[PDB]
Design a protein around this ligand. Sequence first.
Ligand SMILES: OC[C@H]1O[C@@](CO)(O[C@H]2O[C@H](CO)[C@@H](O)[C@H](O)[C@H]2O)[C@@H](O)[C@@H]1O
Length: 580
Amino acid sequence: AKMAFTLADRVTEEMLADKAALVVEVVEENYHDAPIVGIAVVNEHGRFFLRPETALADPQFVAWLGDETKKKSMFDSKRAAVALKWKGIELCGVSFDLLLAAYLLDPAQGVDDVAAAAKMKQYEAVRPDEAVYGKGAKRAVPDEPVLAEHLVRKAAAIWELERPFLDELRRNEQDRLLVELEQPLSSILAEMEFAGVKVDTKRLEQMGKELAEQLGTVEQRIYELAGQEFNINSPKQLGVILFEKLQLPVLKKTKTGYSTSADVLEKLAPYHEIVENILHYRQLGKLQSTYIEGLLKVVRPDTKKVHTIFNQALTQTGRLSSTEPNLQNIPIRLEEGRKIRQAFVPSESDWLIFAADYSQIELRVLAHIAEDDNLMEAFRRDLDIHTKTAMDIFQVSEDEVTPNMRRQAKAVNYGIVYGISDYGLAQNLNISRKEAAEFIERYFESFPGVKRYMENIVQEAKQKGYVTTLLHRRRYLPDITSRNFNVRSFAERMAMNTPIQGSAADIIKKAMIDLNARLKEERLQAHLLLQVHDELILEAPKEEMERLCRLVPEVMEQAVTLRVPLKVDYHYGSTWYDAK
DNA sequence: CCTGACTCGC
DNA sequence: ATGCGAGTCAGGA
Ligand SMILES: OC[C@H]1O[C@@](CO)(O[C@H]2O[C@H](CO)[C@@H](O)[C@H](O)[C@H]2O)[C@@H](O)[C@@H]1O
């Protein structure tokens, strides 16, 4: 059953065909400055395994890797491209990435290795990486014989599966989504990750000491108010102290019993002082663990930079996810945590951080897709959408809109996008299930276009079996036909939300691509550092700020043309915190 | 090691 | 049962 291949000692001419399936293996999950343990090439002439030390030292191979005219088919080309960047080697000409192709065909499959992608086409002559390398404490690179056969089988699979994957992508009208959006974006993300973001570690350690001090005070205050010490981080221990020793009221429970969620403690706060302290302790506790100690652990000692990894094939909606560290969830809501951003600084002297973000892109996308006259007119007048919704569902003038009315219209606007229920609008606004239902009724009366879209998209999900975004990304919703109300309802909410969140993702991804091209033709030194769903963060010399103030917003606003305008706000400063 | 609770972001 | 994510810690394996 073994697969025939040449275990080459030297690089030859036939290994450099202008078309080939290429495997540049990096076994370490975090591929930054990680080892390349082997190389496999499959082309018209045969199958080959090359030892990295040999291949990467050969000027002929290296040139082939960087020759844009020599086309390569790979799996997760970003991983190889970045690992190669760390060795000062450029990877060009990747015309097909099986991981991205698999992801577009069905995000739900969770394809993370060649074997899983191959299985989609009944191809099983390749083993899953986990079966070869193992996982966790047991993970390790196998002997050359086992390793070489595994890499060649993966390259062989890629070589065989390219045509079948492209054909289905074409049938789905997703060929351009792969070739003109996701693949080019892959190279941009690779540059972003490689460049990294500089961290002011001394600033972070300084914040750590101040937090450690505060945590100490609130912690002692808590043990005092409870007249006993205990593990505040233990949901089990906290429960006995609150609901037993202190006799606090039990209003909500979890899957295992006593509920000490923030939603519960907020309502218990009036009963005992210890509750507000527990909450605060938890806030500071998150800052310390994840954003102080957690960040410090991944900052490179030598460059003082953090190199995140953007997973481009994980989310079910087309969004990116960020890991080790997650730079898409750095505090900003509360001031204490927002200060964390003062630690993210430009990588060069006299450079500044520039941040641009779309304003209400999801509601604007909803207005476009549903073609609701009232909603489109609101954005055409650049009105405060929450005040406008309040005026409509409460039928009052702009002057009569009280702060509480806007707060509730706000929760309704965002509930609508999430496919909220009269029950969940009730749990969020803490009101009557029938009153929440009437808010929704009112909303759909003022925005019948949105009502029609919600109804039609669900029927479409049931008729076709999936829903799609502006750029043809799709999500299958098999549970939409379930006879179980909860399972079915969840699928209906996904049907309503995916085209919105997904189209917003498509737009910013296209903006990133257009922006990179504009920065290059203008020969600006500014470059992308991060993407946070609806915002782009860049760093550039202070001298380029005036030009970026006009360029970035324009590129983002013109990424796609909708029935309503796209609005972008931007700010810049000496740190990410100041880019406000 | 793996699932759940919790808090962080958009 | 309002959409989509990641990291840390407690729990028990
Ligand atoms: O390289 C990113 C790419 O790899 C996958 C597996 O094919 O995820 C691996 O790497 C991530 C970044 O280190 C980890 O979070 C993940 O656990 C690991 O399996 C893909 O999901 C991803 O697109």
